[model samples]
Target: GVFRVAVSSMISPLETMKGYGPVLSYIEQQTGRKVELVQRRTYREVNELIRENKIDLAFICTYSFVEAELFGARPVAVPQVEGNPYYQAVVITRRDSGINSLEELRNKRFAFTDPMSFSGHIALRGELVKVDRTPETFFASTFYTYSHDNSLRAVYDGIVDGATIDSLVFRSSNILYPEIGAALQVVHVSPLVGAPPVVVSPGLSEEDYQLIRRAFLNMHNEPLGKQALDTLFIDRFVMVNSGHYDYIREIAGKI
Candidate 1:
């Protein structure tokens, strides 16, 4: 059987390869099994594939993982970035838009990276909840651009007045494209939430699952593995259980 792996474009493809290639190669070598790396256009699509058992392992958003686990798939590991397993959602707008407050965005077009995104959708809606409103009644309209980079770019080009995105991804984009923050400004940062998790399908036996988990947990010991993690802004992988995502579920449930 082929051991397939996949990742959502939370980091975008090119930056994704900064770590994707190394992780897949290491899994292949360590597991002594051929690994096939797959890519999809949206976080939802990649997530559905994992839930459908079309892939064995995938790096999926925490919200997606929560939904997937309900259908029988399970979380195997969660990555620690910048030394913490938590990140925030940042609401951004064009610097020239003069939109400094969430109330100012009322009736304006907004972008979301994925409907299942914790930072992208839940957190944005959570903001609205604080004021007793909803997206349909808040923003003039909203749409998913599929990738966080595209959502940020949409604001850059004036396709939308603003967007909600992962802070880690937004920071990475700003680092690579100075034009990001130079033209845009963050208006709201949500309460911190758990980072995305690497999930495994039920197809893997307990033995196989532990094998792959071991490789990921110890990836930092090797040179190439360390390089991949560094380039991807990941500090390390930590074992996690389904309960860790319960907070996200409550947030999403409220929306």
Candidate 2:
């Protein structure tokens, strides 16, 4: 069966899709099936495309995966780092803020990335809830940076007392751009959970599903796949079912 894969711009910018354009073409060459890569500016848009059946497969966040599963999308694989199937959310403050715990953040300005983001929203909200403080009541003021890096910079520049950042993004930015990461320190971390998963619409045939799964699961062994995986800081892909995202769904329910 033909596959049209959609990926979020959160992973990379829209213009960079041209790089993956050839990757999709490579998939077509290797699998002898039509493969298209569609880049979307937000997970919400990608979710809409999947729900409307305009896309056949996608690499979506845990939150979007849960939502899409409700519309008959099935998870085929999850990205892995090291040997663990997990990612983290970090609460960060400027290195010199002298604040080392959540309680110290009380009455301080806070920066959030996006309301729909799991790390930037739900995990951060969950942390606040644990301390019996809602976002409205917890901060002197709150605002969104719209991007994880922006939120990080806001805290680094002392514009906000603290911010919640995706651990993967934090780590990557730190490695790729150490000057920005050095300005802050992590005060807390959220519980670990599965990373992003690749899902396909239920309309795909079993044979086609296996082919797509095999392509991803073994991609790390190929040159282009190896480069993409390294750039994304992912180790490999592991087969996973839709039920693995229950925690994310539960968090969404609480918010």
Candidate 3:
């Protein structure tokens, strides 16, 4: 039987899509099972397909992994970057804005990337709660930019006083996208949590799961796989379970 895998569009850029193709081809060559790659625009849409038992595996965000597990999907592994199982969300402001800390953000306009993003929502909100403020009461106005880059740009252009963006996006700006990063400065960083996980529908056969899992865990060993991962700034895939994301669920309850 063929194995179907879906990767979130948030994770798969067009240039790196070919990197996954080689991994998929390798999976088919070794396991003798056809492998298909599916890409979706939002995690919500990916979860919807998983809930209906229309897909076998997916690369999904932490928040979406929690939602998928509730619908009979389980996380098999999460990509680790530079030896850390977790990543951060940063609260940023323009250097010239004179905002020095979270306390300075009160009554200021804020930009959030997406309502469902783990870094954009749960992590940022959790940090605010720790400091004794809620988004509703702390900020004068809040808006969603829908993309991390846009949030960074909002802060840079003074469209908003500050914004929360994923660490990966911030790093990309610091390295490859310097122009976008030049005008902003990070003021706060959220607590670390596991990066997005690769999940499989509970109904998939054990054999199929094993093959798919092996492909991801070993992909870094191959040239194409290694190149794709390097471009994405991922080190390798490590075994993880859905239970690891319980903290996200706990915080979501409070928010």
Candidate 4:
């Protein structure tokens, strides 16, 4: 079967996906196939599509993968950020909110990218546990935006007092759009966890799967591929094993 390749529209942040455009283009060129950038309203929607055999070559959220691991979604690779394949989750507040710590966000309105998002919600769940508070009891109210960019805007526009955002997304936003830093600041950062993986259909032919996998692992070494990775703030792509995600399940299970 000639399945279409795609990026996870529901699981990945839009700001971050823009950087992956070039990478996908390279995949399309290498395989002589159409690599689609599939989109859905939430991460769960996209993940289910992959599980239900509706998409191929998807980039899924860490939590999504953990929740539906029994699905035929074998991993291909994980992105290396700042030379590490793990990244942190950050709690953010508007610069003038007078909030400086996880404890300070008590009773304040908060934004979550999605309930199913690890860095957006579960990471916060685990983070608050350390401080003896949980999202439900800690915030005055919560807004489920389903997108990190929307969560960022909620804080910047004063719609929400704080937000739990993926550190990779937050950093990329600030670096790409400097004005984001003017309005928001990181108040708390969660412990590092495995980054998301780019997965292939379990039904895919090994020959084609390896073609996609090797393309990413070697992306940093080639000039055109390096340009694609540079846009995503990635140092390289590593073939990580399931062991890297044991801690991820421990933290995401709290959700």
Candidate 2 stretches with Cα past 4 Å from truth are 18-22, 241-244
Local distance difference test values of all predictions, in order: 0.81, 0.77, 0.77, 0.78
Model 2, residue 157: C-alpha shift (Å):
2.0
How does each model score on TM-score? 0.90, 0.86, 0.86, 0.84
Cα displacement (angstroms), candidate 2, residue 78, comes to 0.9
lDDT of 4 by residue, 133-214 (tens): 7788889998888878789878888988998888877887898888877888998987777888888766677897888888
Worst 10 residues of 4 by lDDT: 1-10
- Give lDDT tens digits, candidate 1, residues 105-206: 999999987788878887788668878898888999999877778899999999999999888778878888997769988898887777777888867789
Q: What is the lDDT of candidate 3?
A: 0.77
Error of 4 at 212 (Å): 2.4
lDDT of 2 by residue, 80-107 (tens): 8867677788988877889898678889
Q: List the residue pairs that clash in candidate 2.
A: none
Q: Output candidate 3 Cα RMSD.
A: 2.6
**TM-score of candidate 4 relative to the true fold:** 0.84
In angstroms, the error of model 4 at 248 is: 2.3
Instruction: Mark the 10 consecutive residues where model 1 has the least summed lDDT.
Output: 9-18
- The count of residue-pair clashes in candidate 1 stands at 0
- Quote the lDDT for 250 in model 4: 78
